[PDB]
Amino acid sequence: IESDLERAEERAELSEGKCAELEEELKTVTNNLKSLEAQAEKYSQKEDRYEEEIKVL
Amino acid sequence: IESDLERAEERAELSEGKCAELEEELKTVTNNLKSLEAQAEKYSQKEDRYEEEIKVL
DSSP, rough: HHHHHHHHHHHHHHHHHHHHHHHHHHHHHHHHHHHHHHEEEEEEHHHHHHHHHHHHH | HHHHHHHHHHHHHHHHHHHHHHHHHHHHHHHHHHHHHHHHHHHHHHHHHHHHEEEEE
């Protein structure tokens, strides 16, 4: 049972480290995603203004 | 020792489940990221197109 406890402790430490790394990567990806969402919203605004001017002309 | 092993295993499963949920969130967000990337590319192409269209108009 002591050997089993050692195995479990090592497995859990590995899993916790991996989870922390994945959380960091998720936060970075979320920042990138919101920046690109802002970019897309700007593009949509400009395209809408373009279409309005097109229909006016 | 068995009590310690039981706590260690429980902690391992909780960290593993949080890791798996984090991974599925990661892949769903990557899907959304690729989708919005393609969307923004299409908006930029349409913006250019509409620019020359309005010039000709």
